[PDB]
Design a binder for these strands. Structure first.
Lengths: 129, 129, 129, 129, 129, 129
RNA sequence: UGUCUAAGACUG
RNA sequence: UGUCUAAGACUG
RNA sequence: GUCUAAGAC
RNA sequence: GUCUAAGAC
């Protein structure tokens, strides 16, 4: 099939959507970046490794930028005022069947679904209480 | 506004859903667990702190049990063969407004949305190809 | 001409066949696996590189699960008791034309053809006698 | 029965066939060579060993020559311009039944069947992509 | 999706075309090789890397062989009488947008378009005059 | 006759075209520069030399600028916010006939033809994937 | 383990 | 493990 | 900088 | 090998 396809990272209903596309696979790290200057692009990376003798570990990262225009030496350049970083490590035993893995994906999706505790605290610059 | 409540971690359309409820708040770290023995339960923990001068950092952890061939309430060893661990670290600059954070959340939801590259790879015991 | 596709690894006449599909391409190494947990799956990997000034070398690996008394989706230990490993290394001089290579392939097919010495010995837990 | 028999290594439909025959078993290594001068002969060798306390390892090798006639000191001699080498190691747990082993042989046969990914890449001086 | 695909390196109408195919991607270095004798094959390699804080750098290489037959001692082999080597370095600031990059590419294409100075000098064994 | 003439470096239909013209030929190094502010001009240089007893070597260079306005102390000047640098070395044996050279050129043109791997990666701020 | 001059060599 | 200047760094 | 070319000097 | 790019380190 090939799962290395582009996808919409930030959905704002058809328009204003942040979509990311395959851009590199050098050294076994799959990379996706948005259609911007390398300095303002959204970035996503993924890699898998047989960490232990009986474990596999996924390493996923996402970079969300706050774009801005900076004047350096009298000249304006496209930059990122700052970047937000998401870094997740996922360890799955080799004994996990496909259905066991689907269970993990579903858990991760439920964890961040709108209305639930965590995504609500994050979106309000708050903690859980 | 008081978000430490029970929520659906794994959704299967009402029937067969996995719910996770508050189980500990020691040290300000929110903990949620399913109705199982702690060796077979679904566990979620979350906490925020200012990691540095310019950043705040959320630390979210999830534990998912291997269910295929599982014996409910039994002693399953080795523990490493029956459990998967997710560790997320979200770094957000102190300049991020609620709007900025809402977008960061959407980015995370899009990353794991059903049908996209990352979740499709994980659910199929695969890497990117 | 774009050969990284799914194929039948174990043929049993349509019914009960074992299919192996693309699962990873990190580092340019093609990987195929069956629809199982990685501890019980059939795995195939392949890659070529120039091993020396005069030679190119293909490195092909295969992993086959022990099926008799197997428990699908279960945790089977020790791993060394439930898996067989095949490691092939094919060295081909840079002077070999496509025709030369076609013959090399035929030589490999003949070596393992049903009814010949090598496969007959292996299939019977025997040596040469 | 006795499996140490001659067999056709390269099949070209009755005529032009490269057939190999038993030629030595000294030191536990079974050898087969084609009917040529030792310097231009196709060669096949096989041996089994109880490698681990619970493993058996087969070591198989095939030598495919590119015959040529070389003039050495004004005299012509039958030689091999170069040789292609196939070297495979197969490790099978002692717990593998005969049917488990038949499964391995079938996997190896399917791996090299015409039309499938690997033999196609090899025959075209190509990699998998 | 993937750009590590085979392509036409030399176009001579429909037939006489030189095609190059993916052969290896070790260490972030993509490599394409034409078919038949590796000794007479065309070669193309490509890689990118962050050369500095504000620059990314591409390293493209091409090898064009002069097909010939070598005879020594009465033994002949397919070889390259000699090779022509092309090596290019392309540095692009991280501020470049997709439009800026598309422009850079057009500049490279125009530099080598039939009829222009550089390509015409090379094709005629000449310099600028 | 002369090949030290002006040519279209960047083609954008009829208008929007970047033309480069002969500006200097000191020390066997031919140089072309686009019109207007030298500070925002495109640059191309070319030279050939006998690199060894049997090889001639070309050195082609291109500079693509990012046009911008610099303001310092209220004084503005036409400048290049930054530049993209291309540098290539082409080695060709003295045995190459005009046909061989025409072939080398076609190889360079194909390497950068629209739709192929290298030009497409560069145009999209990407590597090979 | 890797390579090759290939059942013997080399290299960690 | 922790942090960040983020597939590379730092710190135990 | 060259070459025997992702190795090198 | 990089860059501020036929100058350079």
């Amino acid at each position: 099939a090939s799962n290395f396809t582009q996808f919409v990272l930030v959905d704002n209903g058809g328009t204003g959507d942040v979509t990311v596309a395959p851009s590199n696979f050098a050294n076994g790290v799959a990379e996706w970046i948005s259609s911007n200057s390398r300095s303002q692009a959204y970035k996503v990376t993924c890699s898998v490794r047989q960490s232990s003798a009986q474990n596999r570990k996924y390493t996923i990262k996402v970079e969300v930028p706050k774009v801005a225009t900076q004047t350096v030496g009298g000249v304006e350049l496209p930059v990122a005022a700052w970047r937000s970083y998401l870094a997740m490590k996922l360890t799955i035993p080799i004994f996990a069947t496909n259905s066991d893995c689907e269970l993990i994906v579903k858990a991760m999706q439920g964890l961040l679904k709108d209305g639930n505790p965590i995504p609500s605290a994050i979106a309000a610059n708050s903690g859980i209480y």
